[PDB]
Structures are given as structure tokens and as C-alpha cells.
Design an enzyme around this catalytic site. Structure first.
Site, PDB file in Angstrom:
ATOM      1  N   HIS A  62       0.936  -1.155  -0.072  1.00 44.19           N
ATOM      2  CA  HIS A  62      -0.184  -0.215  -0.029  1.00 44.19           C
ATOM      3  C   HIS A  62       0.771   1.153  -0.024  1.00 44.19           C
ATOM      4  O   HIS A  62       0.436   2.196  -0.620  1.00 44.19           O
ATOM      5  CB  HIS A  62      -0.949  -0.064   1.079  1.00 44.19           C
ATOM      6  CG  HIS A  62      -1.881  -1.232   1.322  1.00 44.19           C
ATOM      7  ND1 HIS A  62      -2.724  -1.352   0.473  1.00 44.19           N
ATOM      8  CD2 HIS A  62      -1.744  -2.137   2.206  1.00 44.19           C
ATOM      9  CE1 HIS A  62      -3.224  -2.721   0.865  1.00 44.19           C
ATOM     10  NE2 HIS A  62      -2.881  -3.167   1.946  1.00 44.19           N
ATOM     11  N   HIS A  92       5.060   6.875   7.328  1.00 52.70           N
ATOM     12  CA  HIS A  92       4.979   6.602   5.570  1.00 52.70           C
ATOM     13  C   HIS A  92       4.380   7.671   4.764  1.00 52.70           C
ATOM     14  O   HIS A  92       3.917   8.813   5.458  1.00 52.70           O
ATOM     15  CB  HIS A  92       3.898   5.311   5.741  1.00 52.70           C
ATOM     16  CG  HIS A  92       2.586   5.678   6.174  1.00 52.70           C
ATOM     17  ND1 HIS A  92       2.355   5.753   7.499  1.00 52.70           N
ATOM     18  CD2 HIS A  92       1.426   6.339   5.428  1.00 52.70           C
ATOM     19  CE1 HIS A  92       1.054   6.275   7.801  1.00 52.70           C
ATOM     20  NE2 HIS A  92       0.696   6.700   6.598  1.00 52.70           N
ATOM     21  N   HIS A  94       1.849   9.110   1.181  1.00 52.42           N
ATOM     22  CA  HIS A  94       0.641   8.882   0.492  1.00 52.42           C
ATOM     23  C   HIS A  94       1.150   9.636  -0.852  1.00 52.42           C
ATOM     24  O   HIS A  94       1.873  11.222  -0.483  1.00 52.42           O
ATOM     25  CB  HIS A  94      -0.456   9.324   0.932  1.00 52.42           C
ATOM     26  CG  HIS A  94      -1.104   8.385   1.938  1.00 52.42           C
ATOM     27  ND1 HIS A  94      -1.792   7.394   1.999  1.00 52.42           N
ATOM     28  CD2 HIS A  94      -0.839   8.569   3.272  1.00 52.42           C
ATOM     29  CE1 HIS A  94      -1.909   6.861   3.375  1.00 52.42           C
ATOM     30  NE2 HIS A  94      -1.343   7.592   3.977  1.00 52.42           N
ATOM     31  N   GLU A 104      -3.601  13.526   1.059  1.00 53.00           N
ATOM     32  CA  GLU A 104      -4.936  12.970   1.604  1.00 53.00           C
ATOM     33  C   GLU A 104      -5.742  14.087   2.254  1.00 53.00           C
ATOM     34  O   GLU A 104      -6.903  14.393   1.655  1.00 53.00           O
ATOM     35  CB  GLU A 104      -4.846  11.879   2.735  1.00 53.00           C
ATOM     36  CG  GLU A 104      -3.995  10.486   2.197  1.00 53.00           C
ATOM     37  CD  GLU A 104      -4.290   9.289   2.911  1.00 53.00           C
ATOM     38  OE1 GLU A 104      -4.154   9.404   4.055  1.00 53.00           O
ATOM     39  OE2 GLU A 104      -4.643   8.444   2.376  1.00 53.00           O
ATOM     40  N   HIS A 117       2.915  10.940   7.065  1.00 52.34           N
ATOM     41  CA  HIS A 117       2.298  10.636   8.263  1.00 52.34           C
ATOM     42  C   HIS A 117       3.368  10.057   9.098  1.00 52.34           C
ATOM     43  O   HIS A 117       3.768   8.846   9.008  1.00 52.34           O
ATOM     44  CB  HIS A 117       1.191   9.503   7.880  1.00 52.34           C
ATOM     45  CG  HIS A 117       0.039  10.436   7.240  1.00 52.34           C
ATOM     46  ND1 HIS A 117      -0.723   9.801   6.561  1.00 52.34           N
ATOM     47  CD2 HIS A 117      -0.180  11.706   7.196  1.00 52.34           C
ATOM     48  CE1 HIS A 117      -1.639  10.380   5.925  1.00 52.34           C
ATOM     49  NE2 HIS A 117      -1.307  11.579   6.317  1.00 52.34           N
ATOM     50  N   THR A 196      -6.811   6.705   7.885  1.00 49.32           N
ATOM     51  CA  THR A 196      -6.941   6.723   6.479  1.00 49.32           C
ATOM     52  C   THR A 196      -7.141   5.450   5.501  1.00 49.32           C
ATOM     53  O   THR A 196      -7.471   5.708   4.506  1.00 49.32           O
ATOM     54  CB  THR A 196      -6.177   7.865   5.733  1.00 49.32           C
ATOM     55  OG1 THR A 196      -4.970   7.363   5.567  1.00 49.32           O
ATOM     56  CG2 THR A 196      -6.306   9.208   6.573  1.00 49.32           C
ATOM     57  N   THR A 197      -6.742   4.500   6.165  1.00 53.72           N
ATOM     58  CA  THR A 197      -6.541   3.243   5.654  1.00 53.72           C
ATOM     59  C   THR A 197      -7.340   2.042   6.413  1.00 53.72           C
ATOM     60  O   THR A 197      -7.697   2.403   7.692  1.00 53.72           O
ATOM     61  CB  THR A 197      -5.377   2.451   5.474  1.00 53.72           C
ATOM     62  OG1 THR A 197      -4.569   2.282   6.811  1.00 53.72           O
ATOM     63  CG2 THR A 197      -4.422   3.500   4.568  1.00 53.72           C
TER      64      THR A 197
HETATM   65  N1  LIG Z   1      -2.772   6.825   7.145  1.00 59.32           N
HETATM   66  S1  LIG Z   1      -2.625   6.960   8.769  1.00 59.32           S
HETATM   67  O1  LIG Z   1      -1.712   7.680   9.194  1.00 59.32           O
HETATM   68  O2  LIG Z   1      -3.966   7.391   9.133  1.00 59.32           O
HETATM   69  C1  LIG Z   1      -2.339   5.174   9.202  1.00 59.32           C
HETATM   70  C2  LIG Z   1      -2.822   4.017   8.562  1.00 59.32           C
HETATM   71  C3  LIG Z   1      -2.253   2.703   9.016  1.00 59.32           C
HETATM   72  C4  LIG Z   1      -1.711   2.654  10.063  1.00 59.32           C
HETATM   73  C5  LIG Z   1      -0.961   1.173  10.477  1.00 59.32           C
HETATM   74  N2  LIG Z   1      -1.280   0.085   9.541  1.00 59.32           N
HETATM   75  C6  LIG Z   1      -2.686  -0.497   9.674  1.00 59.32           C
HETATM   76  C7  LIG Z   1      -2.903  -0.912  11.293  1.00 59.32           C
HETATM   77  C8  LIG Z   1      -4.001  -0.503  11.978  1.00 59.32           C
HETATM   78  C9  LIG Z   1      -4.425  -1.015  13.039  1.00 59.32           C
HETATM   79  C10 LIG Z   1      -3.919  -2.394  13.527  1.00 59.32           C
HETATM   80  C11 LIG Z   1      -3.039  -2.657  12.699  1.00 59.32           C
HETATM   81  N3  LIG Z   1      -2.291  -3.845  13.336  1.00 59.32           N
HETATM   82  C12 LIG Z   1      -2.723  -4.442  14.833  1.00 59.32           C
HETATM   83  C13 LIG Z   1      -1.376  -4.687  15.713  1.00 59.32           C
HETATM   84  O3  LIG Z   1      -0.299  -3.813  15.528  1.00 59.32           O
HETATM   85  O4  LIG Z   1      -1.441  -5.639  16.412  1.00 59.32           O
HETATM   86  C14 LIG Z   1      -2.324  -2.138  11.597  1.00 59.32           C
HETATM   87  S2  LIG Z   1      -0.297  -0.419   8.259  1.00 59.32           S
HETATM   88  O5  LIG Z   1      -0.630  -1.689   8.027  1.00 59.32           O
HETATM   89  O6  LIG Z   1       1.141  -0.231   8.792  1.00 59.32           O
HETATM   90  C15 LIG Z   1      -0.220   0.663   6.672  1.00 59.32           C
HETATM   91  C16 LIG Z   1      -1.079   0.274   5.992  1.00 59.32           C
HETATM   92  C17 LIG Z   1      -1.189   1.286   4.536  1.00 59.32           C
HETATM   93  C18 LIG Z   1      -0.467   2.183   4.724  1.00 59.32           C
HETATM   94  C19 LIG Z   1       0.433   2.580   5.688  1.00 59.32           C
HETATM   95  C20 LIG Z   1       0.265   1.777   6.787  1.00 59.32           C
HETATM   96  C21 LIG Z   1      -1.036   3.730  10.677  1.00 59.32           C
HETATM   97  C22 LIG Z   1      -1.477   5.104  10.322  1.00 59.32           C
HETATM   98 ZN   LIG Z   2      -1.127   7.544   6.244  1.00 55.53          ZN
END
Ligand SMILES: NS(=O)(=O)c1ccc(CN(Cc2cccc(NCC(=O)O)c2)S(=O)(=O)c2ccccc2)cc1
Ligand SMILES: [Zn+2]
EC number: 4.2.1.1
Length: 258
Positions: A62, A92, A94, A104, A117, A196-197
Site C-alpha cells: 500500500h 509513511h 501517500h 490525503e 504521516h 485513512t486506511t
Molecule cells: N494513514 S494513517 O496515518 O491514518 C495510518 C494508516 C495505517 C496505519 C497502520 N497500518 C494498519 C494497522 C492499523 C491497526 C492495527 C494494525 N495492526 C494491529 C497490531 O499492530 O496488532 C495495523 S499499516 O498496515 O502499517 C499501513 C497500511 C497502509 C499504509 C500505511 C500503513 C497507521 C496509520
Molecule cells: Zn497515512
């Protein structure tokens, strides 16, 4: 058929697996600069990254995440609208296929080329997974990117991207200083919102800096050479990995500055 940013699995589809997509505090939002109110009461914002310990960079299919050691109070965000201490876990970006889109958040409907972010979790909940279940669990510092002069502090990130081209690839990424990604001013907007994801959890205090950073066209071109696909799969360039603005609903955006 898992979620993504394609025609068939993009933002307009997410609500079918994640009904909170149509919730009351979704992100991102358009920041109407004339409607946002100065809130004298927002304490100072404190970004304390001197002891940050980066570990790894991962293409997650992603975006790419730069991961930090969050097992102690090394890199923390405090102050501003926040109560308590938030630990940096990852950053990360976008970004778009073209310089006219990619952020975003928007500012008076303006889209920036990309958005950074920096993700932090509230230490009172012990771990990230517990924090995302709470309305005050996360604080995300959002920084806009415009195309112009190069950002020197970004180049180490740009230069490792060849080594994580496809989904599931990672590389060692020690000794990276996230202070090199900040603008001069810490003036910001803040509002309560969401990831946002997927899973789109309503757990984020958003802190969006007013001042964008400048990156070069060469730098953002290297972002756009990443792949959403895994190795030995048809190539899908990692571009346009942004969610559009969501309804503000019953929220007020506050400004830290007059
Ligand atoms: N865009 S943002 O700043 O809003 C934001 C978006 C997403 C996240 C983190 N992700 C999802 C997530 C969320 C909840 C639980 C878990 N795991 C549960 C655990 O760790 O036991 C994981 S990711 O897969 O790393 C990711 C995915 C797509 C792009 C970037 C990061 C953080 C901030
Ligand atoms: Zn983000």
C-alpha cells in the site's frame, strides 16, 4: 479481493468490509482555512526525535513504512492538543501519479503532491494494538510535500526504495533521523479523526502542519517507481495511494496560529 487503491478495491469500496468508512469522524478532511478557528488554549507542540531509533523499511503493498523502536520513550510527540505522551512507531507517505494530486488532507481544496504521516501511539494504552481501540489512541503528524527543491533529509529514503520495490520486501534502515523531514514552522491544524486506511478506526488526533516541505521531481519520481504487486507478478506502479477527503460532520478544525 482485499482492499487497495484500484477501480475495483479502492476507497469507494472499503465500506463493504469496513462499515466505519461512513462513520462520524473519518479522515482525511478538507481544511477550510477561513473556518478553522485559532484556539489560544492549545499548549506548545513538542516533537522530541533526538533519540529516535529507526530499524527497517518495508513495502507493505500500500505504501512503505519506516519503522522505529517504540519499546522505550525515545521519539515522542507531546503538547499541542495532546494529553500525555505519544511514541513514534512508523512513518509513511501517500502520493500521486502526477504532482497535482497525492495528499490525503487538502487545504481549501488544494491537493499537494504527497503527504507524510508520522504515526504515534498513546503510552497510557501500553501497545499500538490496544491504542487503536481508543478514541485518543494515536496522534498522526501530517506534513504536506510540494515539488520544488530537493529535501536533503529525504534522500536516504529515496535511495533505498530500489531494494524494496515489491510488496513484502524490507531492508535494514538504521540511523535515519526523522527531524530531517520537518518544515521550519510547527504551526498546525488539529481535529479528531481516523486512520485513512482500513481498518479506518476512529482513534486519531490529527495534527497537520501548515508549512509544506519541498521535495524534488527526481525524489517523487522514485516513489512512483515502487510497486503495489509482489515479485514475479505483473507490474502495478505504487501511485495514487491516497484516500479522498471525507465529510467533516460534527467537527471543528482548530488552528494553533493566529
Ligand atoms: N494513514 S494513517 O496515518 O491514518 C495510518 C494508516 C495505517 C496505519 C497502520 N497500518 C494498519 C494497522 C492499523 C491497526 C492495527 C494494525 N495492526 C494491529 C497490531 O499492530 O496488532 C495495523 S499499516 O498496515 O502499517 C499501513 C497500511 C497502509 C499504509 C500505511 C500503513 C497507521 C496509520
Ligand atoms: Zn497515512
Amino acid at each position: 479481493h482485499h482492499w487497495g487503491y484500484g477501480k475495483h478495491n479502492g476507497p469507494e469500496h472499503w465500506h463493504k468490509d469496513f462499515p466505519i468508512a461512513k462513520g462520524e469522524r473519518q479522515s482525511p478532511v478538507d481544511i477550510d482555512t477561513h473556518t478553522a478557528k485559532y484556539d489560544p488554549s492549545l499548549k506548545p507542540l513538542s516533537v522530541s526525535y533526538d533519540q529516535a531509533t529507526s530499524l527497517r523499511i518495508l513495502n507493505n503493498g500500500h505504501a512503505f513504512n519506516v519503522e522505529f523502536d517504540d519499546s522505550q520513550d525515545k521519539a515522542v510527540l507531546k503538547g499541542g492538543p495532546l494529553d500525555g505522551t505519544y511514541r513514534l512507531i512508523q512513518f509513511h507517505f501517500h502520493w500521486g501519479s502526477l504532482d497535482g494530486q497525492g495528499s490525503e488532507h487538502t487545504v481549501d481544496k488544494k491537493k499537494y503532491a504527497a503527504e507524510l504521516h508520522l504515526v504515534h501511539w498513546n503510552t497510557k494504552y501500553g501497545d499500538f494494538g490496544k491504542a487503536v481501540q481508543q478514541p485518543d489512541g494515536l496522534a498522526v503528524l501530517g506534513i504536506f510535500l510540494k515539488v520544488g527543491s530537493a529535501k536533503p533529509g529525504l534522500q536516504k529514503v529515496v535511495d533505498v526504495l530500489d531494494s524494496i520495490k515489491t510488496k513484502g520486501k524490507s531492508a535494514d534502515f538504521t540511523n535515519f533521523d526523522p527531524r530531517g523531514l520537518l518544515p521550519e514552522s510547527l504551526d498546525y491544524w488539529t481535529y479528531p479523526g481516523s486512520l485513512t486506511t482500513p481498518p479506518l478506526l476512529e482513534c486519531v488526533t490529527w495534527i497537520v502542519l501548515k508549512e509544506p516541505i519541498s521535495v524534488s521531481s527526481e525524489q517523487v519520481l522514485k516513489f512512483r517507481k515502487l510497486n503495489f504487486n509482489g515479485e514475479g507478478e505483473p507490474e502495478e506502479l505504487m501511485v495514487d495511494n491516497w484516500r479522498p477527503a471525507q465529510p467533516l460532520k460534527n467537527r471543528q478544525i482548530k488552528a494553533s496560529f493566529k
